[PDB]
Amino acid sequence: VIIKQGCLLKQGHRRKNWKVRKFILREDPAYLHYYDPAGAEDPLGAIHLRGCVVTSVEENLFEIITADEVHYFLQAATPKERTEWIKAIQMASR
Numbered sequence: 001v002i003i004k005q006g007c008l009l010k011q012g013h014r015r016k017n018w019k020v021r022k023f024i025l026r027e028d029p030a031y032l033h034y035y036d037p038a039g040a041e042d043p044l045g046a047i048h049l050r051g052c053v054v055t056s057v058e059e060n061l062f063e064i065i066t067a068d069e070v071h072y073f074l075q076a077a078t079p080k081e082r083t084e085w086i087k088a089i090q091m092a093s094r
């Protein structure tokens with residue numbers, strides 16, 4: 001069951017550039033998979049949300065810090081979309 005999907009920009013870890021990715025949030029277990037919007041069917045990666053912390057912080061930025069301390073910086077297109085994503089991620093992290 002897919003709780004939420006949509007696109008966000010995601011910042012790279014070393015080079016700080018922002019790329020559009022499609023995100024799919026699932027809840028049992030809680031994963032945020034992300035995919036190249038124009039490319040491969042296979043996911044590029046997945047974020048394990050159990051125990052993560054998400055915070056509002058370019059604008060409409062927010063950050064996820066996972067249980068193993070990885071930081072992901074994301075940017076929504078509007079403040080409303082940021083608010084919705086943060087709320088959905090928090091709920092799924094429980």
Ligand SMILES: O=P(O)(O)O[C@@H]1[C@@H](OP(=O)(O)O)[C@H](OP(=O)(O)O)[C@@H](O)[C@H](OP(=O)(O)O)[C@@H]1OP(=O)(O)O
Nearest residue numbers: 010011012013014015016017019021034044045046
């Ligand atoms: O090559 P992998 O998939 O191991 O890692 C890349 C990161 O590369 P490095 O670890 O820094 O070598 C990339 O970061 P930089 O390009 O270095 O800024 C990062 O942009 C990659 O993200 P996508 O999967 O394409 O969404 C991707 O990082 P993610 O693990 O997916 O967030």
